[PDB]
Design a protein around this ligand. Structure first.
Ligand SMILES: CNCc1ccc(O)cc1
Ligand SMILES: [Mn+2]
Ligand SMILES: [Mn+2]
Lengths: 137, 137
């Protein structure tokens, strides 16, 4: 039986800028680094950065919608978004759904999101206003 | 302040086979599905499957090392891995370079993993068998 997400591993083209982004800009805790990767944590999330010559710096128009959303409180959302903007971090989408969301790119074009709200909150909103063809279980 | 992973969203090319893979084969909990997506949970993880015409079925030699690992207990690991193998689930990696792991592919080629152990346990193991150049903070 699967019990949760164990870790998220992102392939990176250059380890130093990716460590700077996740540790310094995004505030994650750096636990270890080696010649070809790093381990960080963000709350319960175990993040691994893996140096990979196969990683392309990928424009957002050229990748699919797969993305990784980090939790932040509503009270902290606007100042964190402003921090990313000050740092010149690109946005790949505007929010049009329930709950605050900021959609931003990592140095290699990994699609990231800041989101306020849980699955339970989303499901409650969907029950009141179901998406097209929506069924609940 | 970021506090963890809010959700993981995977772009999928065909919604029904992907829902079947995550719910029926992997045992995740299906909460809702609609014409363009589905919401599942795996413990605390919120998983969203999003139908995306841009998603390509991608062989593992064509994608980088970005991957998603799910937690499983030591007691359940081997029989779950063997069940996936007997079901014909494609793989992408054999060498256990980060502990007790089974590396497998979803229907679109998303790189998945079963892993036994926490970040703390992996750091302890690495102190004895470190990756080249490893520093611990
Ligand atoms: C047509 N709405 C999407 C959907 C929902 C439930 C289901 O059994 C199949 C498809
Ligand atoms: Mn999202
Ligand atoms: Mn892994």
């Amino acid at each position: 039986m699967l019990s949760g997400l164990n870790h998220l591993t992102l392939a990176v083209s250059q380890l130093a800028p990716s460590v700077a982004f996740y540790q310094q800009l995004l505030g994650m805790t750096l636990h270890a680094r080696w010649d070809s990767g790093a381990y960080l944590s963000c709350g319960d999330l175990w993040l691994c950065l893996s140096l990979d010559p196969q990683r392309r710096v990928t424009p957002p128009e050229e990748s699919d919608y797969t993305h990784y959303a980090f939790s932040i409180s509503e009270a902290d959302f606007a100042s964190f978004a402003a921090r990313l903007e000050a740092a010149g971090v690109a946005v790949w989408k505007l929010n049009r759904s329930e709950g605050a969301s900021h959609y931003f790119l990592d140095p290699d074009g990994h699609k990231l999101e800041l989101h306020v709200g849980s699955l339970a909150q989303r499901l409650a909103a969907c029950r009141e206003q179901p998406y097209k063809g929506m069924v609940f279980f």
